[PDB]
Amino acid sequence: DRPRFSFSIAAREGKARTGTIEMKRGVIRTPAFMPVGTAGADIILGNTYHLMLRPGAERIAKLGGLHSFMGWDRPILTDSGGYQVMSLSLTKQSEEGVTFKGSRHMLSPERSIEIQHLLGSDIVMAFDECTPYPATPSRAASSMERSMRWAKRSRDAFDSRKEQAENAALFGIQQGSVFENLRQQSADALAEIGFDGYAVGGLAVGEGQDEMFRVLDFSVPMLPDDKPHYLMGVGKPDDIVGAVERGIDMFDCVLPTRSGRNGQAFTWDGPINIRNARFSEDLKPLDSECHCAVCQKWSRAYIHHLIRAGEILGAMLMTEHNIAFYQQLMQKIRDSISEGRFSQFAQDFRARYFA
Amino acid sequence: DRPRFSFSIAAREGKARTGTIEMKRGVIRTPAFMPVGTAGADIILGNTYHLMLRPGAERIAKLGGLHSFMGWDRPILTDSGGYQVMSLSLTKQSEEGVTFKGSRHMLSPERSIEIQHLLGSDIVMAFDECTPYPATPSRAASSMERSMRWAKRSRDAFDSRKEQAENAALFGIQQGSVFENLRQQSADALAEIGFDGYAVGGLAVGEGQDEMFRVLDFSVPMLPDDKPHYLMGVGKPDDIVGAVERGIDMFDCVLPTRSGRNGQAFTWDGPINIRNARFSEDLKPLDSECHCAVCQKWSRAYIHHLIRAGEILGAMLMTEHNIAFYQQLMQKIRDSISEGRFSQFAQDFRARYFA
Numbered sequence: 141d142r143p144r145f146s147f148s149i150a151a152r153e154g155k156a157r158t159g160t161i162e163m164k165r166g167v168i169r170t171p172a173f174m175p176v177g178t179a180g181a182d183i184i185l186g187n188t189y190h191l192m193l194r195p196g197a198e199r200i201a202k203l204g205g206l207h208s209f210m211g212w213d214r215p216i217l218t219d220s221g222g223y224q225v226m227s228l229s230l231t232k233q234s235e236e237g238v239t240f241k242g243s244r245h246m247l248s249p250e251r252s253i254e255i256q257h258l259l260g261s262d263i264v265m266a267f268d269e270c271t272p273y274p275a276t277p278s279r280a281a282s283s284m285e286r287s288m289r290w291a292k293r294s295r296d297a298f299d300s301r302k303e304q305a306e307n308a309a310l311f312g313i314q315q316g317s318v319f320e321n322l323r324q325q326s327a328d329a330l331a332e333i334g335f336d337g338y339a340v341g342g343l344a345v346g347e348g349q350d351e352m353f354r355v356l357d358f359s360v361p362m363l364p365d366d367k368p369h370y371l372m373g374v375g376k377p378d379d380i381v382g383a384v385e386r387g388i389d390m391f392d393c394v395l396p397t398r399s400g401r402n403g404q405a406f407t408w409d410g411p412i413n414i415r416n417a418r419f420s421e422d423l424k425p426l427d428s429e430c431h432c433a434v435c436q437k438w439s440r441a442y443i444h445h446l447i448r449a450g451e452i453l454g455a456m457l458m459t460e461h462n463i464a465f466y467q468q469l470m471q472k473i474r475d476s477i478s479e480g481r482f483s484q485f486a487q488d489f490r491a492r493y494f495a
Numbered sequence: 496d497r498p499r500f501s502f503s504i505a506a507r508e509g510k511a512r513t514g515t516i517e518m519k520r521g522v523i524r525t526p527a528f529m530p531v532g533t534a535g536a537d538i539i540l541g542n543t544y545h546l547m548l549r550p551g552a553e554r555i556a557k558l559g560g561l562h563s564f565m566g567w568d569r570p571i572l573t574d575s576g577g578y579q580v581m582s583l584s585l586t587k588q589s590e591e592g593v594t595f596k597g598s599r600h601m602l603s604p605e606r607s608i609e610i611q612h613l614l615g616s617d618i619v620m621a622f623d624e625c626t627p628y629p630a631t632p633s634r635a636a637s638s639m640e641r642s643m644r645w646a647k648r649s650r651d652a653f654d655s656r657k658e659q660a661e662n663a664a665l666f667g668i669q670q671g672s673v674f675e676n677l678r679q680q681s682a683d684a685l686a687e688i689g690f691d692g693y694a695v696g697g698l699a700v701g702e703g704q705d706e707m708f709r710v711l712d713f714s715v716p717m718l719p720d721d722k723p724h725y726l727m728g729v730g731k732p733d734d735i736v737g738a739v740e741r742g743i744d745m746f747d748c749v750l751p752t753r754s755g756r757n758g759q760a761f762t763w764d765g766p767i768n769i770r771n772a773r774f775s776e777d778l779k780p781l782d783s784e785c786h787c788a789v790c791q792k793w794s795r796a797y798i799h800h801l802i803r804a805g806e807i808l809g810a811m812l813m814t815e816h817n818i819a820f821y822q823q824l825m826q827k828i829r830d831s832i833s834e835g836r837f838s839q840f841a842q843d844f845r846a847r848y849f850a
């Protein structure tokens with residue numbers, strides 16, 4: 141029987157690592173890309189914010205939990221819900237949690253953990269505040285301090301639910317905006333509490349790649365080396381490659397799914413907008429090397445035709461290709477680190493993706 | 496090597512028949528349902544009207560024809576284009592053809608056959624006029640007479656193109672509105688010209704099932720018994736069953752695809768609207784007996800959730816199920832006729848579908 145949670149590092153190159161997370165429901169190869177569940181991947185994402193509103197977490201539990209509901213028996217990660225509340229919901233913030241609205245709802249560390257328990261997710265995120273960007277030092281500090289108090293409450297709530305403590309894992313989320321001293325204080329607080337994995341929160345919120353990479357440069361080394369590192373909200377293929385170079389093991393992003401509905405396909409030569417007329421007679425597959433079923437069977441010209449015609453099949457094929465591209469990217473990353481040629485891979489990737 | 500076109504009847508019950516059409520690109524089991532290509536089936540439909548406008552028939556030919564373009568190497572049927580022009584396009588009608596509009600376009604028997612040749616379809620429809628309903632006897636007669644002149648021009652155009660005459664098949668289309676004498680004159684004219692198959696045109700245009708069945712009762716026996724009979728535009732499962740009882744061998748309809756994008760799923764107990772709240776906690780598959788991949792894996796509750804959330808996956812799963820349901824319906828029809836229990840099947844089908 142697999143353990144509740146075990147992370148093992150099989151190979152390293154620079155700050156990059158490759159390895160596995162073993163959980164009861166399966167093995168997760170790292171670095172990992174985690175696609176939205178409602179879009180091969182070893183873990184998918186649930187949507188806590190949506191599910192708590194429709195049908196509600198209690199109702200999901202009545203239906204057997206998210207694994208049964210979605211027809212997915214492997215690991216699922218859920219976010220803690222506050223990031224989406226603050227991005228999508230009127231809101232009232234306090235030390236207890238956040239209230240938002242046609243019924244009104246509250247989220248607190250305790251309620252967030254309970255919702256994630258009712259959903260049945262395998263990787264549970266602590267309930268944090270994603271500090272807006274830009275933030276002054278004072279506001280970033282006050283926000284991070286609240287998040288750390290909330291991280292301890294999240295830990296205690298998770299540990300109080302036997303089924304959760306014995307079968308799921310809990311990740312703490314580092315905050316501190318772009319400030320090295322606050323990132324350090326946050327890392328120290330999280331390590332003192334103790335988590336199964338550590339996320340870098342508060343990025344991919346408008347700061348741009350240069351600034352994000354600068355923050356990762358000092359922030360990731362502050363986290364425990366022997367635990368997984370999850371960069372929340374990232375990202376584009378080039379962001380992923382550079383974050384792996386900086387020690388990140390896990391990623392999520394709305395790009396493959398969002399792009400697949402808006403006519404954008406990822407390729408090794410960069411993204412293409414398949415609706416553009418230049419593709420109307422292009423008999424090549426979406427990407428010349430991609431092994432996905434779409435690229436084995438259909439041309440850019442046909443996918444262009446379907447999307448221009450408003451056909452659902454076109455968006456489905458774009459999304460299938462994009463998900464597959466992302467998993468091929470992660471496999472090439474893992475293999476290159478394991479073979480000691482990741483630095484070269486990243487250089488080659490960038491030269492081609494941006495040509 | 497299969498022949499260009501051979502229809503063989505393997506079994507009969509009443510006016511119902513089951514058998515096969517052999518063509519160079521494959522065998523078509525009858526009675527057959529022919530789904531839209533852009534949505535297992537033995538033949539799919541191309542969309543002449545759309546393709547002649549985007550990217551254009553010449554461009555499709557440059558890309559290798561519709562089989563290569565769509566990635567489908569089995570038979571394809573195309574309509575002749577006038578039905579869609581008159582349904583979707585300002586229009587100017589004359590003995591030569593129809594003009595319509597941002598460029599202006601013409602369709603004539605000769606141009607329709609050439610477009611279908613450039614598309615590369617295996618079953619080509621003659622260029623006809625689908626008489627509006629209701630029609631007076633005089634207008635129905637004038638319209639049908641024009642369609643018969645156009646059927647002869649369609650035959651001659653098809654026979655002039657060697658690649659088409661040797662590798663494709665041409666169906667003539669009966670018109671005459673709801674009038675027995677005009678349907679007879681039309682059948683006689685088509686048989687004198689000679690076609691590989693015969694379609695019943697001018698129905699599914701607002702007349703209702705009772706009237707449609709009444710017209711089929713006298714119209715289908717007028718067509719050559721030893722050739723396939725295609726009822727254009729039909730239809731709902733109950734329309735299909737009753738049309739098979741009246742001697743029809745081939746069907747098309749926008750229902751499975753249209754329904755799959757609008758939240759309607761076909762089941763043996765009738766259609767259901769999956770968006771309705773009554774499905775939010777229903778753990779049964781879309782249909783309790785359906786063998787499709789959707790019903791093997793996912794519940795009504797999850798598909799309801801996806802569609803309510805606007806997720807493309809939901810529409811895709813609905814459409815996959817609906818296409819599969821239709822092919823299972825046709826298989827049950829074929830098997831029941833071959834086993835001499837089709838009359839009982841139809842009675843059982845109706846009792847359950849309408850309960």
Ligand SMILES: CNc1nc2cc3c(=O)[nH]c(N)nc3c(CCc3ccccc3)c2[nH]1
Pocket residue numbers: 185186187188217218219220221222223265268269270271313340341342343344345372373374392
């Ligand atoms: C796009 N940029 C982005 N930056 C983020 C920062 C944070 C952050 O600081 N805290 C939390 N908890 N989540 C964040 C998220 C959402 C990630 C997510 C959503 C849904 C499912 C699974 C995971 C972010 N997303």
Ligand SMILES: CNc1nc2cc3c(=O)[nH]c(N)nc3c(CCc3ccccc3)c2[nH]1
Pocket residue numbers: 540541542543572573574575576577578620623624625626668695696697698699700727728729747
């Ligand atoms: C929905 N009702 C409906 N009644 C129809 C009558 C006719 C008729 O009298 N003549 C012709 N030529 N077509 C008809 C069609 C369109 C069928 C079609 C469209 C697209 C692809 C393949 C086949 C009809 N459709």
Ligand SMILES: [Zn+2]
Pocket residue numbers: 426427430431432433434435436461462464465
């Ligand atoms: Zn691909």
Ligand SMILES: [Zn+2]
Pocket residue numbers: 781782785786787788789790791816817819820
């Ligand atoms: Zn099904």
